[PDB]
Design a protein around this ligand. Structure first.
Ligand SMILES: O=C(O)CN(CCN(CC(=O)O)Cc1ccccc1O)Cc1ccccc1
Ligand SMILES: [O-][O-]
Ligand SMILES: [Cl-]
Ligand SMILES: [Cl-]
Ligand SMILES: [Fe+3]
Length: 498
């Protein structure tokens, strides 16, 4: 019991196929599967399964020297055959990985020997190693657990080289993990971790208070923020709030009336009292966001001009673009048509509902009629893929995704960001520059390109940045300080030390 912990997650961890997406949970995939190279807090990668690498002048050709002491948790060796088999299994599903540009860059992968793995690329793709460090999909299952020599159609046992092993999984109840006693690296202090399936935020908070669970770790939706604050004050409990990890924002549809109008999007960026929204819906626990990426994100310190909360300026912009108040209605019209904007969100999510109503109230004050469209997850996702939205809640991806991979993704037609940007005349140019920036090794041209991309996106008011949000922890005191993992979607259980 003293080196075993119980914690919670909103759904099961999934089958833990290392190469597929939802319902697999990334943090669980990272507990079982490892990358060639490991991301660090400081933005670099260090050696991991690969102990060294070289790259051609090219540098389109890469040669990794792997550790020779690693075994999958079932005793089978990790070597360059296994690695290459994994990359093949991922790339037989190439289409599915379209959002990750490394998947389109990989041209060939080949085991030169047990300890040498060669990977060759379409281009001198700068973010190569960071993308290899990601939870998915470039991590390694024992080949012997492939189904008919593929992973794309399912796996057998989810055997990784990772510091944790999936002991047991009860659909809709729990998942139990156990420390890998034959890990190649440092042994975790925790021996057993039990994940209780609890989808309701307030039910999570209760399970903590009653003592049923020892740990909660998540983003701003981990538990009600008012309860979180009450906890921070009670010495019976332990709580933490990290520094911001990523951005929460609306995406505005530049291709759909009335948000197709620059002037309208500029006003919207002046209408919301952000600090009050945070103080009112997020119990004062998050930070205001003025730009797509916080100035602390790499390449993102551009001196971009915030739009402060300024109702009067929002009105003026509206009036000048011809969106005026009829007698005696509170909602602007121009040319027949009322200033009506649909804001869609997952309607079961109380926090999203909560922020939307505030957004709705603030924009009413400047003569914008926002109708709330709260729908189930899938509908929201289909609107995202389709561009069937005026405004949609959205969020950046945290490190190491931010900003390169988030920017990379704007190019993919089925993503909310591509759809929002469709109305821009500059859209092809941006997508071209996103492509160039990812292959640039002139370091000054790289800065210049990100500058152009982010600036164009800022000045077009594609987004309405709301908050830079944080990770948060609630824990039994006996567990000690809980660390944060470099990768925002990972959970560093192996650094927990009672
Ligand atoms: O899924 C990933 O590995 C990472 N995701 C890659 C893209 N996703 C692919 C998919 O989910 O199929 C699709 C996706 C698109 C837009 C928003 C979120 C999404 O998951 C990005 C991500 C990073 C951190 C946290 C959440 C999502
Ligand atoms: O992908 O979450
Ligand atoms: Cl070593
Ligand atoms: Cl170059
Ligand atoms: Fe994803």
């Amino acid at each position: 019991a003293p080196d075993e912990i119980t914690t919670a997650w909103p759904v099961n961890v999934g089958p833990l196929n290392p190469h597929l997406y939802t319902p697999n949970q990334m943090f669980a995939q990272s507990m079982v599967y490892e990358p060639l190279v490991k991301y660090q807090a400081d933005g670099s990668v260090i050696p991991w399964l690969a102990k060294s690498w070289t790259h051609s002048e090219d540098g389109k050709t890469w040669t990794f020297t792997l550790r020779d002491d690693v075994k999958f948790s079932n005793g089978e060796p990790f070597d360059a055959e296994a690695a290459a088999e994994n990359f093949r299994a991922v790339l037989d599903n190439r289409q599915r990985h379209a959002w990750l540009e490394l998947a389109n860059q990989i041209v060939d992968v080949k085991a030169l020997s047990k300890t040498e793995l060669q990977i060759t690329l379409k281009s001198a793709y700068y973010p190569f190693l960071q993308e290899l460090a990601l939870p998915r999909p470039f991590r390694f299952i024992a080949p012997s657990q492939f189904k008919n020599h593929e992973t794309m159609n399912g796996i057998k046992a989810p055997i990784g080289t990772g510091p944790w092993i999936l002991q047991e999984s009860k659909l809709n109840q729990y998942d139990v993990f156990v420390r890998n006693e034959n890990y190649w690296g440092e042994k975790p202090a925790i021996k057993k971790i039990t994940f209780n399936v609890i989808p309701d935020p307030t039910t999570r908070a209760v399970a903590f208070e009653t003592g049923d669970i020892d740990l909660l770790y998540g983003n701003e939706g981990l538990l009600p923020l008012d309860t979180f604050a009450r906890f921070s004050q009670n010495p019976a409990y332990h709580t933490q709030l990290s520094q911001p990890i990523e951005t929460v924002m609306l995406a505005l549809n530049t291709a759909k009336a009335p948000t197709n109008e620059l002037a309208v999007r500029e006003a919207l960026n002046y209408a919301v009292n952000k600090k009050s929204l945070i103080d009112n819906a997020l119990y004062g626990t998050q930070q205001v966001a003025d730009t797509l990426f916080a100035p602390s994100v790499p390449y993102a310190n551009l001196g971009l001009k915030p739009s402060q909360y300024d109702p009067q300026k929002a009105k003026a912009l509206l009036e000048k673009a011809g969106w005026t108040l009829p007698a005696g209605k509170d909602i602007r019209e121009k040319n027949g048509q009322p200033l009506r904007i649909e804001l869609s969100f997952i309607g079961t999510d109380a926090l999203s509902k909560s922020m939307a109503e505030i957004i709705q109230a603030d924009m009413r004050q400047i003569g914008a009629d926002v109708s709330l469209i709260g729908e189930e997850e899938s509908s929201i996702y289909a609107r995202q893929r389709d561009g069937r939205f005026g405004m949609i809640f959205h969020r950046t991806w945290g490190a190491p995704y931010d900003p390169h991979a988030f920017l990379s993704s704007m190019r993919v037609p089925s993503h909310a960001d591509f759809q929002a940007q469709q109305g821009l005349a500059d859209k092809p140019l941006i997508d071209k520059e996103i492509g160039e920036v990812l292959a640039t090794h002139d370091e000054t041209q790289r800065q210049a390109l990100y500058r152009d991309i982010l600036t164009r996106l800022h000045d077009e008011a594609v987004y309405l940045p709301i908050s830079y949000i944080s990770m948060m922890v609630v824990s039994k005191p006996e567990l000690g300080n809980i660390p944060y993992a470099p990768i925002a979607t990972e959970i560093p259980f192996e650094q927990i030390k009672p």
